[model samples]
Target: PIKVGDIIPDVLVYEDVPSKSFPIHDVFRGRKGILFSVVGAFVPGSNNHIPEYLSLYDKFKEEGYHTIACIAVNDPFVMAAWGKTVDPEHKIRMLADMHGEFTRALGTELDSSKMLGNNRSRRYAMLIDDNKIRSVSTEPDITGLACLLSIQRQ
Candidate 1:
């Protein structure tokens, strides 16, 4: 798994359109940011985690931070829909790891094929500084994600 101080892997994640592929490293390089991975779009825990970060988005940006939410079990269109449903202002960038590629690169892939019929990402949050991971927090229950944001704020 990627640890603190490790340079994150450059992975392709889709924004509003899969054809518009964005490289993760390019977007965050030389910038401080928060990248969070969620199990699925519109799930209960994800709902809580996203809004908490959204509410804090402005404060973080003021402090020079970018916020992104990556959903493992969704395509770009679904992610866009979820973002619209929860954040019409689009304060946070929503990413879709449609094939679990990005999630696997982070070593946080969760096997829930029996339930969701596809591999998903575990709930996790990371604070990145200048393209390197500074801190990471993960939990199946998702509370650690909130804690990670607080850690970044401090």
Candidate 2:
């Protein structure tokens, strides 16, 4: 699993209007950012966590902080739609890890077949600078998500 000070793995994720595979390394390198992963879109925990990241993106973007929400078990279309619903302003970039490639690479994938009927990502967030992780926060309780917000204050 990636840890603080480790360079994030290069992985492809789907994003944007037309939804194409883009290397995560390219987007995060040379930038300070947050990458939040959620189990699925439109679920209670994910529905709540994503909006908070969107607000964080809006709050810190001018300071060169980029934020993205990666949704496992979802395709680009569903991710985009969910992003539009919670972030009509389009402040947050939503990413799709349809086959769990990125999530598996990060070692944050969760086996949720009993409940969700699929393997998905756990609820976690990471703060990265120049592609190296600075901090990582993982929580089953949604409230723990606030930890990522504190990054902007630092």
Candidate 3:
């Protein structure tokens, strides 16, 4: 698992469309921001997680953070639809780590195929800069929402 001060892997994740893509390393390269990954889009725990971050969007930017994004082990289409359903107010970025490559790279993969019918990312929120992790708050039980909600953007 990536720890504090560890440089994150250069893994690809898609935006609203699969055609639009960028590696996480490129996205955060030389930028300081908040990055959070959820188990699956529209899943129960993610229902709470996404909104909390949406509401805190401006505050994160106001505090000088460059970007605040939510990622999931879903395809771009579903992830895009989920963001629309929640109404990000056009501030938050939704990413699709479709193949779980990003999840495995971060060592945050969760085996919830029995419940979710596929691999997914464990819930985690991290403060990152220059493509390196500064701190991480991960859910103790893989898909729980507590740690993410409790993280302070300030």
The numbered model that scores best in lDDT is: 3
The residue-by-residue lDDT of candidate 1 on 33-73, one tens digit each, is 87787778876667766666776766666667755555555
lDDT of each: 0.75, 0.72, 0.77
**Model 2 clash pairs?**
none
Candidate 1 residue pairs in clash (backbone atoms < 3 Å): none
- Sort all candidates by lDDT, best to worst: 3, 1, 2
| Candidate number that wins on lDDT, 1 or 3 | 3
All predictions: root-mean-square deviation over Cα?
A: 2.4, 2.7, 3.3
TM-score per model over all chains? 0.87, 0.83, 0.86
Error of 1 at 95 (Å): 0.5
* lDDT-best of 1 and 2: 1
Task: Report the lDDT of model 1 for residue 38.
Answer: 72
What are the per-residue Cα lDDT tens digits for candidate 2 across 53-140?
6555555666567555455568888888887887788766788887788788888878787988778888877777888888777775
lDDT per residue (tens digit) for residues 1-154 in model 3: 6788898778899988889889877778888877888788889868766665666666666556757778899999999999888764756688899999988888888989999889999888787787888777776522213323433432
Error of 1 at 17 (Å): 1.4
Question: Measured by TM-score, how close is model 3 to the native structure?
Answer: 0.86
**Candidate 3 backbone clash number:** 0
